Every structure is written in structure tokens, then in C-alpha cells.
């Protein structure tokens, strides 16, 4: 046909301005191509600046861009290959395979920009997702068709937590899973890809029931922004056209907001609170609403929010809290004392913690665990200042029991054996609720609190207590 040629007029960091002629203006978020010596550069039209000039966001590095270079309009937004062909392949933001295994022979390439399915939702938030992690299986149950937050700052252990999530779930899940790796470590992605390869999760010459998306934080802001969108395109195509339950996996959903703020700083927008993009809520909602159960298929989301400067009140983590059925807040303070995973027991929360879905027994156990932990945190100040002696017998017993539960919350992970030094444990929901019910009644008050450290079920607690009392003492 007739190519739509545009001329580069401004290159502002990761943002490129393109000027067209009369009646050839690409719409917002259209994909634009420039034949750079290293390959092709994709530009997404962020704004129309008028006078037939469009403000665009770069999918790759803007070095080597000369003003006036020819710009080709693809005729639509960025299209990523979709279908079972992409399963087992590693794809960047653009859509080309980066797994060096040849081009993807996908029959369709759905655009990364799609409208939410509106009110095609279901209130099926009643199926507990058994992950094997005793703390989340007790305090903040995960939804099979819902969204999991998995908050945390630097360190804390969010990456090992999500990796344990894949290891326990995607191995024996009835459907496909998609990992996006939004602005994370490329070495982490390589290691986790190798880990799935060893487990047979991604079999190159086989079923390979998992599709991988990458474009980690080494990529420019536009990439880190749109890699979540392309992973969502993969997930939505598997969810609707294939009718399969999909295990989404986003290693850092915050990096999308970080990239949005980065491009907004160059988009000529007055900054929002804490210097974020003003549209942070709008783009964040547009991102999260593509992750919905929908009439056909279902999605599990599983996010991982990075809180800047360990500030839970930061605008992006505050905004993402609404778009999450269950959250798992990892606090660095708990990480200091060594209870791992560092999930905050009384900051994770889950909509699934209701007696109708839970069963009024596990719900009561979780409520009493929260009771003990909240009392412990309330009394920490006078415990440090005065000590345990000042408290009455009931308060002293409550503090000791809460310490025991908080130690018991630690659970070894199979993906963290090199760190713990102890083989990982997968605790069933019934096992952990029975164990914590037994703990709450005081049946294990005589057992030292250290026996609850890096253990699984209550039988493991008894075994560790016996070993410490006999072999160690």
C-alpha cells in the first residue's frame, strides 16, 4: 500500500517526536518503525502535539536517532504473537522472540492495547488457592481467579516468594502460566527460566505449558512500561480464545508505574504527588482491569509490588492495593529478625478471609493469630522499655504465644535451600490450620519458641523440639 512516512523532530531521552503530513496522523498508542542500523525501533504514539506532530515513547534505546529520519507507521498498535506457539518462548516488548529459537509461528498477533472486558466478571472469589506457604494459607488466602499482591521493599524476599509460588503451583496447574518479569534482574530471569527448564515446566522439545516475557529493567522506560501490556495480551488470549485458567506472574508491577513516571517527566506533564505521573491511577487501573476472571477462562494474576524506600504510603503501592483481591505485604523489619518469608502477618490481608468461604474454623484460627500478633505489637513498646515482668500472667502468656506463632510463620522454600540450608516444606492448608489451632490452645506452650523456626507442620515443630532438647541439650 502507501507507506506513512514520518520525520523525527525531537528525541527527548526515551521520547521521540515525529511529524507527519496532512491526514496521515497515527492515533494514540500506534506503533511506529524506524530502520536503525542495529535493526528496527518501535515507537508508541503517546500524545498528539498538534501541527501533525506526535509525541511517542521508545520501545528501545534512542541512541543514533537523527532528526528527520524516516518513520514508518505500522497501521496499528504493537502486536505480539499469541497462542500455544508462544508457550516456551521468551519475548521482549516488541513481540519478536528473544529466546534465539527461531521466529514464533503464531497464527494471530493481538494488540497489546485492549479494552477491559467490562461487566463480564464473576463473583467466583470463593476458591482457596493452596500455595503450600503456611502463613498465606492461614492469614491471607490466595484466590484461584483473583489477584495476589505480594508487596515488599528492597530485599525482604519478594522474588523468592514469587518463585516459590511458581514452583508450588505451575508445576501441577490445570492450564498455562505467563511470566512477564517487569523491570527485574535479567540474571534472575535467566535463573528462573533455567529452573523451569530443569523441572520440566518449560520443555523445549515438549508441551512447554508456560510462556515467558522479558525486557527487564536494563531496557528503556517504554519497554518496562509495555512489557506488562504484552504479557497481559498473552494472558488474555490464553484466557478467552483458549478458555484456559491462566497463571499470570508479574515480578514487579511497580516498575510499570516507575516507567510511566519516567516518561511523564519527559512528556511535558506537571508531576503528581511524590513526583509521579498524574495518570498513575488511570494507567494502573487500565493495566489491572485486563487481569479479570471473565466469563470464559480465569486469571490468577499474582503481582509483586515494590514499595519505594520501604514506604507503604507511596502513591503507586497505595494505588495498587485497591486492584488486588489478596495482598502479601513483606516488611523489612520482620526480615531483620529472620522470620522468613518476611510477610507481615497483620498487613497482608485477603478478601477470602470470611467464614462463608473459609469455614469458620480456619477463620477463627486466623482471627486469634491476628489477635495475638496485634497484642504483641501493641505491647512491644513497654516490652522494650519495661520488659515481660511488668505484664500480668495473661499478657505474658499472650506475648509468649504470639512470639511462638510469629516464629512458626517462617517456612522453608524449595527455591531458597541455598539460603536457609534446610530442605523446603510444602504445608497443606488443613495441616497448617490444625497446627496453629493446636498452638493457640496452648498445647505446645512448653516447647521453646526456637522449635517453631524454619519448620513446616506441627509434627516438624515437635521433631525440632525433641532434637533441641535431646541432641542439642
Amino acid at each position: 500500500s502507501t507507506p506513512i512516512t514520518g520525520k523525527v523532530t525531537a528525541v527527548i531521552g526515551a521520547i521521540v517526536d515525529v511529524h507527519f503530513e496532512q491526514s496521515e496522523l497515527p492515533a494514540i498508542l500506534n506503533a511506529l518503525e524506524i530502520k536503525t542500523p542495529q535493526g528496527k525501533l518501535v515507537l508508541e504514539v503517546a500524545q498528539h502535539l498538534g501541527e501533525n506532530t506526535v509525541r511517542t515513547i521508545a520501545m528501545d534505546g534512542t541512541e543514533g536517532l537523527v532528526r528527520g529520519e524516516k518513520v514508518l507507521d505500522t497501521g496499528g498498535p504493537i502486536s505480539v504473537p499469541v497462542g500455544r506457539e508462544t508457550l516456551g518462548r521468551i519475548i521482549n516488548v516488541i513481540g519478536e522472540p528473544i529466546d534465539e529459537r527461531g521466529p514464533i509461528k503464531s497464527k494471530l498477533r493481538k494488540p497489546i492495547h485492549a479494552d477491559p472486558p467490562s461487566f463480564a466478571e464473576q463473583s467466583t472469589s470463593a476458591e482457596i488457592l493452596e500455595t503450600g506457604i503456611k502463613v498465606v494459607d492461614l492469614l491471607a488466602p490466595y484466590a484461584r481467579g483473583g489477584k495476589i499482591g505480594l508487596f515488599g521493599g528492597a530485599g525482604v524476599g519478594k522474588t523468592v516468594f514469587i518463585q516459590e509460588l511458581i514452583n508450588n503451583i505451575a508445576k501441577a496447574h490445570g492450564g498455562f502460566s505467563v511470566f512477564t518479569g517487569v523491570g527485574e534482574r535479567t540474571r534472575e530471569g535467566n535463573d528462573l527460566y533455567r529452573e523451569m527448564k530443569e523441572t520440566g515446566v518449560i520443555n523445549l522439545e515438549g508441551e512447554s505449558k508456560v510462556a515467558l516475557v522479558f525486557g527487564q529493567m536494563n531496557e528503556p522506560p517504554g519497554a518496562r512500561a509495555r512489557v506488562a501490556l504484552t504479557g497481559l495480551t498473552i494472558a488474555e488470549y490464553f484466557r478467552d480464545e483458549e478458555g484456559q485458567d491462566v497463571l499470570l506472574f508479574i515480578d514487579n508491577i511497580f516498575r510499570f508505574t516507575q516507567a510511566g513516571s519516567e516518561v511523564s517527566a519527559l512528556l511535558g506533564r506537571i508531576p503528581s504527588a511524590v513526583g509521579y505521573q498524574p495518570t498513575l491511577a488511570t494507567d494502573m487501573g487500565l493495566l489491572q482491569e485486563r487481569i479479570t476472571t471473565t466469563k470464559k477462562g480465569s486469571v490468577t494474576s499474582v503481582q509483586a509490588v515494590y514499595v519505594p524506600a520501604d514506604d507503604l504510603t507511596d502513591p503507586a503501592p497505595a494505588t495498587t492495593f485497591a486492584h488486588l483481591d489478596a495482598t502479601t505485604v513483606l516488611s523489612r523489619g520482620i526480615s531483620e529478625l529472620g522470620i522468613y518469608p518476611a510477610v507481615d502477618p497483620l498487613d497482608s490481608k485477603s478478601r477470602l478471609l470470611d467464614a462463608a468461604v473459609v469455614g469458620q474454623e480456619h477463620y477463627d484460627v486466623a482471627s486469634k493469630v491476628q489477635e495475638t500478633l496485634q497484642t504483641y505489637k501493641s505491647l512491644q513498646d513497654i516490652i522494650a522499655i519495661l520488659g515481660m515482668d511488668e505484664l500480668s500472667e495473661q499478657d505474658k502468656l499472650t506475648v509468649e504465644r504470639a512470639r511462638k506463632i510469629q516464629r512458626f510463620l517462617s517456612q522453608p522454600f524449595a527455591v531458597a535451600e541455598v539460603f536457609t540450608g534446610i530442605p523446603g516444606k510444602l504445608v497443606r492448608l488443613k495441616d497448617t490450620v490444625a497446627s496453629f489451632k493446636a498452638v493457640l490452645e496452648g498445647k505446645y506452650d512448653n516447647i521453646p519458641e526456637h522449635a517453631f523456626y524454619m519448620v513446616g507442620g506441627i509434627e516438624d515443630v515437635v521433631a525440632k523440639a525433641e532434637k533441641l532438647a535431646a541432641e542439642a541439650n
Binding site: 503528581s272 498524574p278 488511570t282 502513591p315 490481608k349 467464614a355 489477635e371
Partner: protein
């Protein structure tokens, strides 16, 4: 299916008639469309905040009318709109369909049906931006709003036309207490007395679509969707839609208020509306004020909330009750938006995670939760009757002031501590369990006599259920007496005391 056929024919005939008589010449042409907003030259006769129709079909609204160009906020995505696209001014300020047919339906910010249940039957169209009633047309709030939860009814009563803010941290029960208030109205809405019927309007601004589906199904189960109204402003929806949806829901509630009916509109979130309006201002080139929030977030909140009022008998004696929310960050009540909204609402309902994990299931922070009309807007059987029910709040403040941290002075201090602990034990209420005033009053009375000798604090949970069952059996005469008459007589108080003593004996 003749219905799609004739509706298509009628719509296309209307389009033909519009084309035959349009003579639109001063219509605008888009210069620069940004992120969900477009600047358009032309429209020399455009009214401020007047709806417009872009050539692509996306509706718009005119906040800033600069000389030459006007800023149009888009009520949808900016996918379709491009530079040089024609914009068609609707000629009328943005409005929302209003009437009794909106009941049982879920609508977006503009009022279009999004529940897939067919077209909306509206008795009329009311402006999204409507001036609040003046000093005289209002009336002092005296008719209570039966929330159905013990703590909020006893300590921070809400009345018809009152504006009570459900301020709290993240997932601390804000929408939960909103839901119990929502559901408790089924007792009167299933009757015939319209003066006691209280139609409901939920504002889901900034909430996710899955949460709204949870909401609508929950209302469906407990026979509540028929009298409730869901105005959903999804986060994925354009920020102007989030900004406007509470205003349109306020107009919808004002329809009931001006027609002699009582409406309860819960401005749930409204901090998401605040940040959406911050986005609107920060891409509309408006310089911000504090923490990048625009200047008129206070004016916005106040103008939106003041539309909720109790009209006088001359104006039909209607009422419009507001239940706004504030999502504080880390319990920061002393923040700009929180204290701003608190200065608007006729009292606030504070919820923190501290009491939520401490056991208080309503998470009612009796300290910072205060209602601006204590004696009024409360059930007569629950307000003072025996006196202690009136200074209930002062007694709670005393219990907080001399809690377990304070030294146990003497037997009087021990009795006061026991009374306070038993009382806060009683106030816990399970979710989706609206407890009526005819059942609230005996429990509050039992919290003053027979409370101290409770067998363990944990057993008061089952003690409450057993006391309800006791009041149901051969004591329903007392329940219906306190439900119908409203006030409590001396003989009624004696009978209640005798029943309490008989139960505590067992």
C-alpha cells in the same frame, strides 16, 4: 427479535433528522489530544463543562475554556480520537438520567447502563453539577438512618440527610460498614411506608470491576439490589468519569430527595475521585496546590457533599444521606484530604487496622469517630432512655483514658475497667449481619446491667446470640413494643431489667 429492529430504526431516523437540521459551523477541530484530554480550537459558543461528542464517538466535557482553544476531558479512551477530528457540542451541560427506574440497575458515570439489563428508564435528566440546597430549604436531621451495627448506631448515629464520613486505612472495613448500612435498609424498603423507605446509591469510584461484581452479587443475595443504585467509576475508565461519577450519583440521590423520598448515597472511596481529579488538573495545565493536589479538591468535596441534606416539610420533607469514605495512608488522619473531608461531613467514622486486629470487628474507633447529631438522628429507645445510653460515648472515652495501662486504683476502677472491656466486647458484629434497633436496645441495656458478671470475655459473642434468642421467645412483645413506639416507658424498662436478670441468672 423486533425490539432491536425498531430501536435501530428509531435511532437511525433520529440521526437522519439531526443530519437534515444540524447547521453546525462553529464546531471545533482537535489540535492536540494528550492522555485522555484534547485541546480543540473552535466552539466559540461552547458552555463551560458542556458535553461534546467527538467524531470518533468518545464524549467530552469542557473544564478550561482558554481563549481560542478549550480543554476537553474525554469520557473514555483516547485510542479513537485523533488530531483534526470534528467535535460535536451537545448544547447542554453534562447531566445524568434520574428517576425510580435506576433502581435495580448498575450505571457508569454518565448513567449509561453497564449491567447489560437493557435501557435505563429515567423520569428525567438532572445536571451532574447541581447547587446544594440553601439554609432555609434544609431541615435539622432528626430521622435516624438505621445502620444495623451496634457500635456505629450507639456511638455515631447517622440520620436522614446527615453526612457521615467513613474514614479509615486500607481494607479496614470501610466498604464493609458501608455494606452493612446498605443491607440494613431491607427491613423498611420491603414495606409500604415511603417515609421510612430509604433508597440506596452506591458510588464505586476507583474500585475495580471485580469488586463491583462482588458488590452487586452481594446485594443480589440479600434482597438488596432492588432498592440500591450502583454508580461504578472503574479505575480503567477515564479519570474524568471517576471525577464525575460521584456528582452524577449525587444528582440521582437528589432526585429522590426532592420528591419526598429519603436517599442514602455512599461516596465509597472518593479518594480515588480525589486523585482522578488531581490527574485532570495536572494534565489540564492547572498548577497544583498541596502535595500536587489541585486547588479545588476542598471545594470539589464540599460542593459534592453539600448536596446531601434533609429537606424541610415545605420542600417535601425529603432527605439525602451521604456516607463518604477516606482511605488514609498509614492511619494519617492529620493529612490534607482526610481533615478536609472531616471538616465537610457531619462527623466521621474512624477505622484503623489497630482495632481491626485487636478484635473489634466493626473496627469502630470510638475516640475519633464522632457524630454531629447525637441525641437527634437516633432511635428514642437507644438515645438516652436510662441515661447511661446517652453518655455511652463519654463512658467509652473514660474507659480509653483509664485502660489497662492505667493503674487499677480500687474496686470502683476495677468495675469501670470490667464495664469498658465487656462493652467493647459486645460491640463486635459479624459482617453481613445487620442487627436491628429493636434488638440493639436490649443488648446496649444489658451492657449496663448484668454486663460485669459475664463468664469470660470470649463467651459474650455467643451470649449475644443467646440473648437475642431469649428476646425472641415469649418476649417478642417487648421487641415489637420498642420497635413500634420508639420510646421506652418505665414499665418497659422494668420489664427489660427483669428479662436481663432472668437471662443472666441462667
Amino acid at each position: 427479535k423486533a425490539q432491536p429492529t425498531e430501536v435501530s430504526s428509531i435511532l437511525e431516523e433520529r440521526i437522519k433528522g439531526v443530519s437534515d437540521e444540524a447547521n453546525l459551523n462553529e464546531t471545533g477541530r482537535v489540535l492536540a489530544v494528550g492522555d485522555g484530554i484534547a485541546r480543540v480550537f473552535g466552539l466559540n459558543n461552547i458552555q463551560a463543562e458542556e458535553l461534546v461528542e467527538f467524531s470518533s464517538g468518545v464524549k467530552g466535557m469542557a473544564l478550561n475554556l482558554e481563549p481560542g482553544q478549550v480543554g476537553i476531558v474525554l469520557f473514555g479512551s483516547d485510542r479513537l480520537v485523533k488530531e483534526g477530528e470534528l467535535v460535536k457540542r451537545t448544547g447542554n451541560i453534562v447531566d445524568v438520567p434520574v428517576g425510580p427506574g435506576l433502581l435495580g440497575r448498575v450505571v457508569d458515570a454518565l448513567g449509561n447502563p453497564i449491567d447489560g439489563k437493557g435501557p435505563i428508564d429515567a423520569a428525567g435528566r438532572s445536571r451532574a453539577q447541581v447547587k446544594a440546597p440553601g439554609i432555609l430549604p434544609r431541615r435539622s436531621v432528626h430521622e435516624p438512618v438505621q445502620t444495623g451495627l451496634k457500635a456505629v448506631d450507639a456511638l455515631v448515629p447517622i440520620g436522614r440527610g446527615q453526612r457521615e464520613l467513613i474514614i479509615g486505612d486500607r481494607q479496614t472495613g470501610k466498604t464493609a460498614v458501608a455494606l452493612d448500612t446498605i443491607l440494613n435498609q431491607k427491613r423498611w424498603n420491603n414495606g409500604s411506608d415511603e417515609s421510612k423507605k430509604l433508597y440506596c446509591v452506591y458510588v464505586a469510584v476507583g474500585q475495580k470491576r471485580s469488586t463491583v461484581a462482588q458488590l452487586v452479587q452481594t446485594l443480589e443475595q440479600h434482597d438488596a439490589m432492588k432498592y440500591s443504585i450502583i454508580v461504578a467509576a472503574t479505575a480503567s475508565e477515564a479519570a474524568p468519569l471517576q471525577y464525575l461519577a460521584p456528582f452524577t450519583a449525587a444528582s440521582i440521590g437528589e432526585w429522590f430527595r426532592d420528591n419526598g423520598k429519603h436517599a442514602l448515597i455512599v461516596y465509597d472511596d472518593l479518594s480515588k475521585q480525589a486523585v482522578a481529579y488531581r490527574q485532570l488538573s495536572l494534565l489540564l495545565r492547572r498548577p497544583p496546590g498541596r502535595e500536587a493536589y489541585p486547588g479545588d479538591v476542598f471545594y470539589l468535596h464540599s460542593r459534592l457533599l453539600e448536596r446531601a441534606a434533609k429537606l424541610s416539610e415545605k420542600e417535601g420533607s425529603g432527605s439525602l444521606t451521604a456516607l463518604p469514605v477516606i482511605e488514609t495512608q498509614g492511619g494519617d488522619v492529620s493529612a490534607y484530604i482526610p481533615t478536609n473531608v472531616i471538616s465537610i461531613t457531619d462527623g466521621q467514622i474512624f477505622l484503623e487496622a489497630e482495632l481491626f486486629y485487636k478484635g473489634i470487628r466493626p473496627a469502630i474507633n470510638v475516640g475519633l469517630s464522632v457524630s454531629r447529631v447525637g441525641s437527634a438522628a437516633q432511635v428514642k429507645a437507644l438515645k438516652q432512655v436510662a441515661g447511661s445510653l446517652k453518655l455511652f460515648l463519654a463512658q467509652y472515652r473514660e474507659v480509653a483514658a483509664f485502660a489497662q495501662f492505667g493503674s487499677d486504683l480500687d474496686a470502683s476502677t476495677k468495675q469501670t475497667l470490667v464495664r469498658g472491656e465487656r462493652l467493647t466486647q459486645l460491640l463486635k458484629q459479624n459482617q453481613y449481619s445487620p442487627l436491628a434497633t429493636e434488638e440493639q436496645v436490649p443488648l446496649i441495656y444489658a451492657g449496663v446491667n448484668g454486663h460485669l458478671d459475664g463468664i469470660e470475655l470470649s463467651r459474650i459473642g455467643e451470649f449475644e446470640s443467646s440473648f437475642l434468642s431469649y428476646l425472641k421467645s415469649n418476649h417478642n412483645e417487648l421487641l415489637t413494643e420498642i420497635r413500634e413506639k420508639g420510646e421506652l416507658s418505665k414499665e418497659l424498662l422494668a420489664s427489660l431489667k427483669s428479662a436481663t436478670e432472668s437471662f443472666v441468672a441462667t
